[PDB]
């Protein structure tokens, strides 16, 4: 508690900036400095004589009251609805005020302890759900990278790509878990963390595991709401707990546990899975071999299924978290049928065959996907996913479809060569569909997608992969200029030329949504061939208009279907 209390008081400036910038993404840096002043005053007035009326209140309620008391702010950035509520309803309104879609903001500025203040402000408002320990550790990595630049501005933009990659990996997992908490409730977060921690810390004992999962679950309730102070406290408490029982949890965290807040926690999260105990059997037979499974379930169902997840997950370090959860659900459903029959021990005896069956099906699928990646390359496989994604979710904006497609192919670029490609691919690919379904909102894309988002956490990815083209789709008009090529397209440009190509393909699939995937891929390759040839020509402009495939159908020139 007391080291954590010191850390919070010493970093109150950074923490205040994170909270306000995440909650009110439109607020300016000058307004951040206003709230920093008022929060530093609050800190001092509490240290000097704690016994005050305002010192008793929770730090998120205090922060939100002072945001709500700023002259004109609620109405200026459209959050007066939240200030007109109080307490839990206000806190909930502020959580709902966050926008994952940060297109409305400009590009990220070029920096040349105000540097950290500015970095934190600019990162936090663009990543409104990322937890504070992650963000404060990202900034410490930015200070080191900044300082290793003696064109020192362009030195900083390069070299920050690994820092940015560290941020997005963490926030992608945090958003997936928070999204799951909103849509499915705390029970599912518990089962996610039973699987994760059991897999990562296989020598841990069940009772200590369940204790640790309760701590992590409470950490997520605070962090997902956006309560930065509580998130720092609850995260420290998780890491204190792990480091105090270190030799009974993991032999891989020695160096981590010697570090300070908040690097300690990030090291632990990043650490490798601990090795399986020598004496750990290949299978725990009591879930299938015993004749008393149904009564053990009936004595305490949630604890019984938690124990199953623990015992299965620590023995299967090569399954993804979604695959473990699918296995839990299959075991649960098998016992729901079996335990009301005349001979329950009979049908549940071979549950491991159902488990092996689904695992084999999933592994085959990933093998096939990685073979397509090897055959086609990154871009080739990206175009296949852009077509499929646009077919099933054509109501999404083209920018979002392109982002989702880029994230989907990066799962394969990261995972396919590695040992244990199956776990890596399936874990990363699950995050992509998580992004699709929303963090702090229930999104309305189309009925079939909405059904996959909301019905079942563990079976979400395979639900989506079984969807056919959205036959409900009525496209808006598209202007001809979306499909025209300009002379600027003919140079060795950055990956904003790749984003232009991706946008073209997505818009094309929207326009021509009734064509087959093969016909769309053929039409797209026709356009690419024409750009390859016309970019070698003198005057590419005229070449494109006299060699491009027709997309319209005569008497229809500015606006297509
Ligand atoms: C379900 O699938 C699993 C694996 O996907 C099957 O596990 C295999 O079971 C056999 C015998 O039960 C294991 O044999 C052992 O192999 C090790 C090799 O290091 C050897 O040292 C031991 O003495 C022993 O012979 C085998 O390891 C294991 N396979 C794997 C990959 O772990 C299991 O048979 C399937 N269960 C059902 C009910 O279908
Ligand atoms: C988004 O969907 C979730 C999932 O149904 C909603 O959560 C439910 O909220 C009601 C009361 O409003 C509770 O009775 C349920 O227990 C909640 N379910 C779960 C699983 O937590 C949530 O209200 C929706 N949010 C919005 C803004 O529409
Ligand atoms: Cl975020
Ligand atoms: Cl920590």
Curated annotation (Swiss-Prot):
Record-linked SMART domains: ALBUMIN
A GO molecular-function descriptor: vitamin E binding
Residues with glycosylation annotation: 2, 78, 337, 356, 442
Entry PTM: N-glycosylated; more than 90% of the glycans are sialylated.
Gene: AFM
Family annotation (InterPro entries): ALB/AFP/VDB, Serum_albumin-like, Serum_albumin/AFP/Afamin, Serum_albumin_CS, Serum_albumin_N
CDD domains in alphabetical order: ALBUMIN
Residue ranges, annotated region (Binding pocket for hydrophobic ligands): 169-273
Name of protein: Afamin
Subcellular location: Secreted
Biological role stated in the UniProt entry: Functions as a carrier for hydrophobic molecules in body fluids. Essential for the solubility and activity of lipidated Wnt family members, including WNT1, WNT2B, WNT3, WNT3A, WNT5A, WNT7A, WNT7B, WNT8, WNT9A, WNT9B, WNT10A and WNT10B. Binds vitamin E. May transport vitamin E in body fluids under conditions where the lipoprotein system is not sufficient. May be involved in the transport of vitamin E across the blood-brain barrier.
Pfam families: Serum_albumin
Domain notes: The second albumin domain forms a deep binding pocket that contains palmitoleic acid (in vitro). Palmitoleic acid is most likely not the physiological ligand. Instead, this pocket may accomodate the covalently bound lipid moiety of Wnt family members.
Species name: Homo sapiens (Human)
PANTHER family: AFAMIN, SERUM ALBUMIN-RELATED
Principal cellular location given in the protein's record: secreted
Disulphide-bonded residues: 46-55, 68-83, 82-93, 149-155, 178-224, 223-231, 243-257, 256-267, 294-339, 338-347, 370-416, 415-424, 437-453, 452-463, 490-535, 534-543
Keywords from the UniProt entry: Disulfide bond, Glycoprotein, Protein transport, Repeat, Secreted, Signal, Transport
Keyword presence, Disulfide bond: yes
């Amino acid at each position: 508690f007391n080291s954590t209390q010191k850390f919070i008081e010493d970093n109150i400036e950074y923490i205040t900036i994170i909270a306000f910038a995440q909650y009110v993404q439109e607020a300016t840096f000058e307004e951040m400095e206003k709230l920093v002043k008022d929060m530093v005053e609050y800190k001092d007035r509490c240290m000097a004589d704690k016994t005050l009326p305002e010192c008793s209140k929770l730090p998120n309620n205090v922060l939100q009251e002072k945001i709500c008391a700023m002259e004109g702010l609620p109405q200026k950035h459209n959050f007066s609805h939240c200030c007109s509520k109080v307490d839990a309803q206000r806190r909930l309104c502020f959580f709902y005020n966050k926008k994952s879609d940060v297109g409305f903001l400009p590009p990220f500025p070029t920096l040349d302890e105000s540097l950290l203040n500015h970095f934190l402000y600019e990162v936090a408002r663009r990543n409104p759900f990322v937890f504070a320990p992650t963000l404060l550790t990202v900034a410490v990595h930015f200070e080191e990278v900044a300082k290793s630049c003696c064109n020192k501005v362009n030195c900083l933009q390069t070299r920050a790509i690994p820092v940015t990659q560290y941020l997005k990996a963490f926030s992608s997992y945090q958003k997936h878990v928070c999204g799951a908490l909103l849509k499915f409730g705390t029970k599912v977060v518990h089962f996610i963390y039973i699987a994760i921690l059991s897999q990562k810390f296989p020598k841990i004992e069940f009772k200590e595991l369940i204790s640790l999962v309760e701590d992590v679950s409470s950490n997520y309730d605070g962090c997902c709401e956006g309560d930065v102070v509580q998130c720092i406290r609850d995260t420290s408490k998780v890491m204190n707990h792990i480091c105090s029982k270190q030799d009974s949890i993991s032999s891989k965290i020695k160096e981590c546990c010697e570090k300070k807040i908040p690097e300690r926690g990030q090291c632990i999260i990043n650490s490798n899975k601990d090795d399986r105990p020598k004496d750990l059997s290949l299978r725990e037979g009591k879930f299938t071999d015993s004749e008393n499974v149904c009564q053990e379930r009936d004595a305490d169902p949630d604890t019984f299924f938690a124990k199953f997840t623990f015992e299965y997950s620590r023995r299967h370090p090569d399954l993804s978290i979604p695959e473990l959860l699918r296995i839990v659900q299959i075991y649960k459903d098998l016992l729901r049928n079996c335990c009301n029959t005349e001979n329950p021990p009979g049908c549940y005896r071979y549950a491991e065959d159902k488990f092996n069956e689904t695992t084999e099906k999933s592994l085959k699928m990933v093998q096939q996907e990685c073979k397509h990646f090897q055959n086609l390359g990154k871009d080739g496989l990206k175009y296949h996913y852009l077509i499929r994604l646009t077919k099933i979710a054509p109501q999404l904006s083209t920018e979002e479809l392109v982002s989702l497609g880029e994230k989907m192919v990066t799962a394969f670029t990261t995972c396919c060569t590695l040992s244990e490609e199956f776990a890596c691919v399936d874990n990363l690919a699950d995050l992509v569909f998580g992004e699709l379904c929303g963090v702090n909102e229930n999104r309305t894309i189309n009925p079939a997608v909405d059904h996959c988002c909301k019905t079942n956490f563990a079976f979400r990815r395979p639900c989506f992969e079984s969807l056919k083209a959205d036959k409900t789709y009525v496209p808006p008009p598209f202007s001809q200029d979306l499909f025209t090529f300009h002379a600027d397209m003919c140079q060795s440009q950055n990956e904003e030329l790749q984003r232009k190509t991706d946008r073209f393909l997505v818009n094309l699939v929207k326009l021509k949504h009734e064509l087959t995937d093969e016909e769309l891929q053929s039409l797209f390759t026709n356009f690419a061939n024409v750009v390859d040839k016309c970019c070698k020509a003198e005057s590419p402009e005229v070449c494109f208009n006299e060699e491009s495939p027709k997309i319209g159908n005569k008497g229809e020139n500015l606006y297509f279907q």
